[PDB]
Design a protein around this ligand. Sequence first.
Ligand SMILES: Nc1ncnc2c1ncn2[C@@H]1O[C@H](COP(=O)(O)OP(=O)(O)OP(=O)(O)O)[C@@H](O)[C@H]1O
Ligand SMILES: C[C@@]1(CCc2ccccc2)Nc2nc(N)[nH]c(=O)c2N=C1CO
Ligand SMILES: [Mg+2]
Ligand SMILES: [Mg+2]
Length: 158
Amino acid sequence: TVAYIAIGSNLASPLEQVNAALKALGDIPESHILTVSSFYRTPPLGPQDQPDYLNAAVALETSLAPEELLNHTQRIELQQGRVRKAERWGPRTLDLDIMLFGNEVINTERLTVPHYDMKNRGFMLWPLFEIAPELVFPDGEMLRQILHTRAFDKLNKW
Ligand SMILES: Nc1ncnc2c1ncn2[C@@H]1O[C@H](COP(=O)(O)OP(=O)(O)OP(=O)(O)O)[C@@H](O)[C@H]1O
Ligand SMILES: C[C@@]1(CCc2ccccc2)Nc2nc(N)[nH]c(=O)c2N=C1CO
Ligand SMILES: [Mg+2]
Ligand SMILES: [Mg+2]
């Protein structure tokens, strides 16, 4: 299956965090990276009192089930010092989100796919568009159309 993963980091040298994450992602069993987007430097969306983010997107081919892939992405986050609390949108060393998993629609307590807010986030959609410009969501909406329609500002590079 082809899964699209979003990467975010705004603490403890984001470039080192993301290069380390790419290596660890390549190490997941039964999986291999297909493509990596450019690295973008984005102002925080949501709480503004935190450093700018390094955001990227990766296409991964995997034969793991969606929740098994999650187990590995959460292990990598933890390995790189991610400590979550119920208070959610603060700074973090590493954030690995599953944006899409094949054409699956998943709605469980652990996993909501497509990512519940990705159509509202330019820092997820632009990097994704760079690696999969003709992508179509499970609901039939085209990625290119969402970007053209919403007029999201373009992103700067890291
Ligand atoms: N598509 C998904 N990718 C990653 N985690 C997900 C996904 N859907 C649901 N989750 C759940 O989200 C929680 C982790 O969210 P996290 O702390 O990293 O939030 P965040 O990424 O900082 O904020 P947001 O989810 O709004 O983008 C975990 O309980 C995980 O099970
Ligand atoms: C912290 C938040 C909050 C996202 C959010 C936006 C609006 C309402 C709720 C949450 N902001 C982010 N900003 C950038 N540039 N990049 C991020 O990766 C990013 N991620 C977020 C949480 O996942
Ligand atoms: Mg996350
Ligand atoms: Mg996130």
